[PDB]
Amino acid sequence: PIKVIFFGDSITQAGVREGGYITLMQEDLKTKGMTDQYELIGAGIGGNKIYDLYLRMEDDVLSKNPDVVVLFVGVNDVWHKASHGTGTDADKFEKFYQAVIQKLQKQNIKVLLCTPAAIGEKIDHSNEQDGDINHYSNIIRKLADDNNCDLIDLRKDFLAYNLKNNPENKDRGILTRDRVHLNDIGNRFVADKMWSAVI
Amino acid sequence: IKVIFFGDSITQAGVREGGYITLMQEDLKTKGMTDQYELIGAGIGGNKIYDLYLRMEDDVLSKNPDVVVLFVGVNDVWHKASHGTGTDADKFEKFYQAVIQKLQKQNIKVLLCTPAAIGEKIDHSNEQDGDINHYSNIIRKLADDNNCDLIDLRKDFLAYNLKNNPENKDRGILTRDRVHLNDIGNRFVADKMWSAVI
Amino acid sequence: PIKVIFFGDSITQAGVREGGYITLMQEDLKTKGMTDQYELIGAGIGGNKIYDLYLRMEDDVLSKNPDVVVLFVGVNDVWHKASHGTGTDADKFEKFYQAVIQKLQKQNIKVLLCTPAAIGEKIDHSNEQDGDINHYSNIIRKLADDNNCDLIDLRKDFLAYNLKNNPENKDRGILTRDRVHLNDIGNRFVADKMWSAVI
Amino acid sequence: KPIKVIFFGDSITQAGVREGGYITLMQEDLKTKGMTDQYELIGAGIGGNKIYDLYLRMEDDVLSKNPDVVVLFVGVNDVWHKASHGTGTDADKFEKFYQAVIQKLQKQNIKVLLCTPAAIGEKIDHSNEQDGDINHYSNIIRKLADDNNCDLIDLRKDFLAYNLKNNPENKDRGILTRDRVHLNDIGNRFVADKMWSAVI
């Protein structure tokens, strides 16, 4: 069975609980009789930034000899500039990110890259940190091309879904519960986009 | 004519692309009717009757609707098995009465839905058919007691599955879930609401 | 004399008291000079579920070398799901029931299978656990067919009798004293259906 | 001629023979130690198993394998399943079947060790939803050890004490478990060490 590890933050940590996006994917395998073809594992820790991934990467990922690692990190590297003054510089973000990919590919792991979903679901580019979120999504998109990795563009997916389903321009409640972390519908949404890119 | 659908994740997802409210709104557009009816969803995932009671002022009364459709009950049954946090039958009826009474005091036309399903099997072998049926019987008594039109989605779901679920599947006819609607299920409930409300 | 053991629960435990369904069967035989053609034994224990039957079936059934065993179990497997949270999983209920049947047939005992009577006598399918009682009935019906055991469809019989004689839609007092255990009329009814299937 | 040790239990023991699982870790510690001749370690775990389940498959999966030492690691599901499916095991019937199982083992002169359940949630202030039954069924397991002259692997006590020292943020998972019930890497390694000290 192809061993897939999701490596990331709280979205990913909460992804293995009930109704989390990884759990939903596991159940889809069960009902589609494909449990023998894939093992999905979550390796997420709340508040993780890209350098945190680099620090725990040997124990939590490489030691498990996965076939596929999906990188779902970036949101905190921006968010924490406003919340704690401890976000990640844009140049070092790309540096740490690239070094994480080069270690994964050196193990012949297939790596996929996720852009951050959201900090606020408002549709008029008025969420306080939309600008860094788009900027760091751009970095991730360049990294995907530079390293020949498939891209899972949740930033793009979340924006497009919100234009179709947020007529009253709410800041949360569409795919997020609190502007960042997912609700039920958002967990199912992300599961679909992961399934398409991975299964 | 301001209509508010007050209830569940079924209603919350009803205002998304493909959900039953969105579809009714497209039908209004098609029929050149959009200035005759303003359809609004006030659904929240996981809500039981007492959750509607707590928020009905900020979310319904203060919007001054002309029409409120109550679409609640499935969680009141379901959460007995999934969390041990369902609603006792007698306090279900009591809260439901309180909600109806508060709306009608504002001269709001209130309409009542039975719960659709927890499992689409046709031989009454879904684990919670019993409470679903009993809580529909409560909702039916209330519509009568308070002269409210009944949208008997439970009745409608059972009749449809009897006709279109030959393999006796627990999901995939009108539900994706045993509980939540698929695209066909949203079109079906859109039709039942339309007939009752428009 | 053909040795018949009723292997079950509380209904079969009370079945051998005065007025219980097994006592009525014994009386009927003596009232027709037949108390020599059949020895009717009650092996019921209140609270028993299918795995309880399995645990004791050698000391209470197999070693008694009966010709006929009537299995009358399952109501607690469903009922205890809500009263104590200790019901029986449907798949393990089928498996234990199958293992019990197979051990009887191995000794060439003749096996008859009873569906659970009721948890509540309301006629509009609005008893709290009608759904599981019906689902577990279907499991018993299937096991009866798979293993060529005659069926005593007490669930069917009770439903129709109540459809007929419970116009006011009461949850008890028709064939049960308290939704589950039998009143006099219920014991007489069950004794009648056991007799047609077993004698 | 090596001592056969079968671990008889649930998902924790089933997952225990995968890489990094607590049994697999224990086997390497025998290789690394050239002690493979002293003990063979077998896992008979099955996800979801409750005490009556073990009783059902006891002849095919344990007794017919003629072991010398059987480690019973069961209980968490007999408690957990009350909340997640309404299909736990009653306290009194939990003891009946547990006693039944121990007796069949000792009737074949097998050495039997009993583990208390580890945890359903790692919160350190007794606020996990089912701490009450876990603690009460742990008390039944301890009584059964003493009644049957079996050694006790008190994983419950062990997990509690560890969390008091390594769980300062009072999280419900992520210390020795990954999801409140099943082990993480560190927890597997922790139970390996706890088993070892009892079974060696």
Beta-bridge partner residues of A44: A8
State the best of D10, D56, D57, D130 to mutate against chain C, taking most chain C CBs within 10 Å: D56
**DSSP string for A22-69:** HHHHHHHHHHTT-TTTEEEEEEE-TT--HHHHHHHHHHHTGGG--SEE
Of B31, B75, B29, the closest CA to residue B180 belongs to: B75
Give residue limits of the domains in chain D. Answer: 1-200
On chain C, the residues whose CB falls within 8 A of the CB of B89 are: none
Q: Are B40 and B33 in contact (CB under 8 A)?
A: no
Beta-bridge partner residues of C189: none
DSSP A176: B
Cα C6 from Cα C112, distance rounded (Å): 10
Q: Are D150 and D114 in contact (CB under 8 A)?
A: yes
Q: Do chains A and C touch (3 or more CB pairs under 8 A)?
A: no
For B124, the closest of C82, C125, C128 (CB atoms) is C125
Q: Do chains C and B touch (3 or more CB pairs under 8 A)?
A: yes
Residue that the structure tokens 């769980």 belong to: D167
Cα B68 from Cα B77, distance rounded (Å): 22
Flag if A59 and D179 touch (Cβ within 8 Å).
no
The half-sphere exposure of A106 on its side-chain side, counting CA atoms within 13 A, is 8
Element holding B74 (H helix, E strand)? helix B74-82
Cα B70 from Cα B19, distance rounded (Å): 16
Angle formed by the axes of helices C50-60 and C90-106, nearest 10°: 20
* CB proximity list for D159: less than 8 A, separation 6 or greater: D118, D119, D122, D176
Flag if B9 and A184 touch (Cβ within 8 Å).
yes
On chain B, the residues whose CB falls within 8 A of the CB of A165 are: 15-17
Tally Cβ neighbours within 10 Å of residue C58. Answer: 11
C partners (3+ CB pairs within 8 A) are: B, D
Find residues 4-43 of chain D whose CB sits inside 8 Å of chain A. 19-20
DSSP C63: G
State the best of D129, D169, D175, D178 to mutate against chain A, taking most chain A CBs within 10 Å: D178
Cα C90 from Cα C78, distance rounded (Å): 9
Cα D8 from Cα D200, distance rounded (Å): 17
DSSP C15: G
Residue that the structure tokens 């079906």 belong to: B188
Cα D83 from Cα B9, distance rounded (Å): 23
**Which pair of tokens denotes residue D198?**
């009892």
**Which pair of tokens denotes residue A180?**
């960042």
Of C16, C146, C2, C1, the closest CA to residue C72 belongs to: C16
* Sign for the pseudo-dihedral over CA of C10, C12, C16, C19: positive
PDB resolution in Å: 2.5
Q: Hey, is the C-beta of D55 within 8 angstroms of any chain C C-beta? A: yes
Q: Hey, is the C-beta of A183 within 8 angstroms of any chain B C-beta? A: yes
CA angle A153, A76, D121 (to 5 degrees): 105
For D97, the closest of C55, C80, C92 (CB atoms) is C55
CA angle D95, D100, D102 (to 5 degrees): 95
Q: What is the largest CA-CA distance in chain C?
A: 47
Length of chain A: 199
A165 CA to chain B: closest CA distance, Å? 6
**DSSP string for B154-178:** HHHHHHHHHHH-TT--SSSSSBSSS
Q: CA A143 → CA A77, A80, A139, B91, distances in Å?
A: 16, 22, 6, 57
The half-sphere exposure of B156 on its side-chain side, counting CA atoms within 13 A, is 17
On chain D, the residues whose CB falls within 8 A of the CB of A64 are: 19-20
Residue type, C176: T
Q: How far apart are the first and last CA of chain B?
A: 10
Cα B14 from Cα B25, distance rounded (Å): 11
* CB proximity list for D107: less than 8 A, separation 6 or greater: none
Solving technique for this entry? X-ray
Residue that the structure tokens 């005992």 belong to: C109
Q: How deeply is A28 buried, as exposed, middle or buried, from its count of CB atoms within 10 A (0-12, 13-18, 19+)?
A: middle
Flag if C131 and B134 touch (Cβ within 8 Å).
no
Name the 3-class secondary structure at A181. coil
On chain C, the residues whose CB falls within 8 A of the CB of D55 are: 51, 54-55
Flag if B128 and C124 touch (Cβ within 8 Å).
no
Residue of B nearest to A186 (CA): B13
Provide φ and ψ at A114, rounded to 5°.
Answer: -110, 135
Residue that the structure tokens 């009460």 belong to: D136
Cα B81 from Cα D91, distance rounded (Å): 21
* CB proximity list for B15: less than 8 A, separation 6 or greater: A165, B21, B22, B41, B43
Q: How deeply is A167 buried, as exposed, middle or buried, from its count of CB atoms within 10 A (0-12, 13-18, 19+)?
A: exposed
Q: Are D91 and D99 in contact (CB under 8 A)?
A: no
Q: Are C94 and C139 in contact (CB under 8 A)?
A: yes
Cα A119 from Cα A121, distance rounded (Å): 7
Q: Are C28 and C63 in contact (CB under 8 A)?
A: no
One-letter-per-residue 3-state SS of chain D:
CCEEEEEEECHHHHHHHCCCCHHHHHHHHHHCCCCCCCEEEEEEECCCCCHHHHHHCHHHHCHHHCCCEEEEECCHHHHHHHHHHCECCCHHHHHHHHHHHHHHHHCCCCEEEEECCCCCCCCCCCCCCCHHHHHHHHHHHHHHHHHCCCEEECHHHHHHHHHHHHCCCCCCCCCCECCCCCECHHHHHHHHHHHHHHHC
Cα A118 from Cα A76, distance rounded (Å): 10
Q: How deeply is C164 buried, as exposed, middle or buried, from its count of CB atoms within 10 A (0-12, 13-18, 19+)?
A: exposed
Flag if A165 and B9 touch (Cβ within 8 Å).
no
Length of chain C: 199
Q: Are D104 and D148 in contact (CB under 8 A)?
A: no
- Please, where are the H alpha helices in A32-182? 50-60, 75-83, 90-106, 130-146, 154-165
Name the 3-class secondary structure at C42. strand
Q: Are B76 and B46 in contact (CB under 8 A)?
A: no
Q: Are D114 and D106 in contact (CB under 8 A)?
A: no
User: Where do breaks (C to N over 2.5 Å) occur in chain B, by preceding residue number?
Assistant: none
**Which pair of tokens denotes residue A131?**
């600008």
On chain A, the residues whose CB falls within 8 A of the CB of D20 are: 64
Q: Hey, is the C-beta of D85 within 8 angstroms of any chain A C-beta? A: no
Q: CA A76 → CA A53, A93, A122, distances in Å?
A: 12, 11, 18
- Please, where are the H alpha helices in chain C? 10-13, 21-31, 50-60, 75-83, 90-106, 130-146, 154-165, 184-198
